[PDB]
Amino acid sequence: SGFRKMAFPSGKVEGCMVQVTCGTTTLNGLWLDDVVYCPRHVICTSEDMLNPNYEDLLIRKSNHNFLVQAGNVQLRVIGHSMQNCVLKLKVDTANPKTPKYKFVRIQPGQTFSVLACYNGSPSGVYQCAMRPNFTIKGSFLNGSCGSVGFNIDYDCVSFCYMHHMELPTGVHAGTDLEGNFYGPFVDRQTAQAAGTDTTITVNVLAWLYAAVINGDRWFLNRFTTTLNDFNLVAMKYNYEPLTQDHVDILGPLSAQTGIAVLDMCASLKELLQNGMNGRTILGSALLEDEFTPFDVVRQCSGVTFQ
Amino acid sequence: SGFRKMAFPSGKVEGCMVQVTCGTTTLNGLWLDDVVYCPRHVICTSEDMLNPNYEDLLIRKSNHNFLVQAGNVQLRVIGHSMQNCVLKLKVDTANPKTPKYKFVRIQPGQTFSVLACYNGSPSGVYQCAMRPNFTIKGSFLNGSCGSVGFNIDYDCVSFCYMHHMELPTGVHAGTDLEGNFYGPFVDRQTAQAAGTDTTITVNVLAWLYAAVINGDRWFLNRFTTTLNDFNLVAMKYNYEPLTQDHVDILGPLSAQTGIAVLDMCASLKELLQNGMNGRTILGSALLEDEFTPFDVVRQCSGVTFQ
Incomplete structure (x- = not known):
């Protein structure tokens, strides 16, 4: 556990x-x-x-x-x-250490690992998410540029990010491996507006299922709700509206814990309107949104890589 | 940043x-x-x-x-x-991939990285701390046993942990690489009492300095205090008593931010008695204790390894 x-x-x-x-x-x-x-x-x-x-x-x-x-x-x-x-x-020399790789362009809400480097030497590694506004909240000092984000699918490394800049606001912007920025950013030292950042609702749900799987069930409530009525409340607290695809993606977590997706929503709805009132979920006093439903399945089933 | x-x-x-x-x-x-x-x-x-x-x-x-x-x-x-x-x-075969290593036995409060494996294959990696009660709050499923914790000092890998068990309470116990358990635990399936867990006060201070370095200064207050009077308040909230060695270890973080150790304590003291009142520090609604003063210096100066 x-x-x-x-x-x-x-x-x-x-x-x-x-x-x-x-x-x-x-x-x-x-x-x-x-x-x-x-x-x-x-x-x-x-x-x-x-x-x-x-x-x-x-x-x-x-x-x-x-x-x-x-x-x-x-x-x-x-x-x-x-x-x-x-x-x-x-x-002139092909890297003898070239792993089986692939270049991909992820979507906001998706998560990946960043290997922070300085002078071409590894400093450290951390997991993070691509915010709905196309920025990332990482840890980069001058010289870090060129650091990559990646995911591992068994024996294949998917490169999805390359760090290019820190914005005057302290957040980070970068590109995919083809050189296209994520977001409306340009690679120049000027003031750039990052839109409004919203909470990745589907990820928050996956995390509540993880909580249930791990013994935290205090937030489970009798109520229920509808997708429309949940979304109306979501929008007031700056949460991403949930769609049917989100509902389907959570299916497995639904079958495993015996709690229907719409019922889970009803518990969330209540936590937004009422708050956590001094209580925590998986050691946290806030609603965590950096775990995708896939990340939860992985950690809860023990998946490995080449 | x-x-x-x-x-x-x-x-x-x-x-x-x-x-x-x-x-x-x-x-x-x-x-x-x-x-x-x-x-x-x-x-x-x-x-x-x-x-x-x-x-x-x-x-x-x-x-x-x-x-x-x-x-x-x-x-x-x-x-x-x-x-x-x-x-x-x-x-019969020596691992050709044997890195320059060393076996060490850490002290509670210290931090290290865990490489979680299943079937001898890497699943994932995370940073964590050795709790004052000698347990760790990790992520291990059956089959994970044998997973190691380590630190990297430039070109030398220090192995300090080997996972052995999950306690009925959901926390983890293990040994150093010589086979001595951390804590009063034995490797058998029985009820085992882990003492009271306390908060690693020196680590919390290092994290407040990190906050200041990164722009969060709202908790800085006019007051000050004494070591004795701070410790008295610490003990009521289950914090580890602070010693002079802790004061010396924070010296560098003190010189860099221009905030004296005892003054920082005064800000902590107040957060314990008053709470964070809906505010966050480095994106957190709780006092974080899994960063040592060394971990903060590393992340804030950009240290690298072989």
């Missing part, structure tokens, strides 16, 4: 972390096969970030302007190209 | 996880050099756990009774011995 905010083992990703330097800027890079991926603002100085013209900047850089170091091994850059917001430094 | 409950990268530990089977029991083992370490109750059936005589049980087992599988590689057991509560299966 027990419930913890668990991250994926990072071994397969550690071996892909390289350090990328260009001029006086140095950040992390992802070495897969014979190509190194990294944020394009590695070609920018501190001054350039205010208003950079990436084409004109990249055009004054040749292959020998990039120093890609993997521990102590040096990679010879043989080609370079800009794909959206990322750089693709084609090197 | 930002603060996350961060775990150490697990790559170096993943390569030491083997599956140990004996009879119909199968749990995880730690393969270092040419020796596999695992809980001795791997030689026990379900019936035996009620009242096991480990010597008499071990005596009816020969080297060929142990099946140690590392992925697909099979290890030939050439020797076996019981050291306190762990088994030491000497095999």
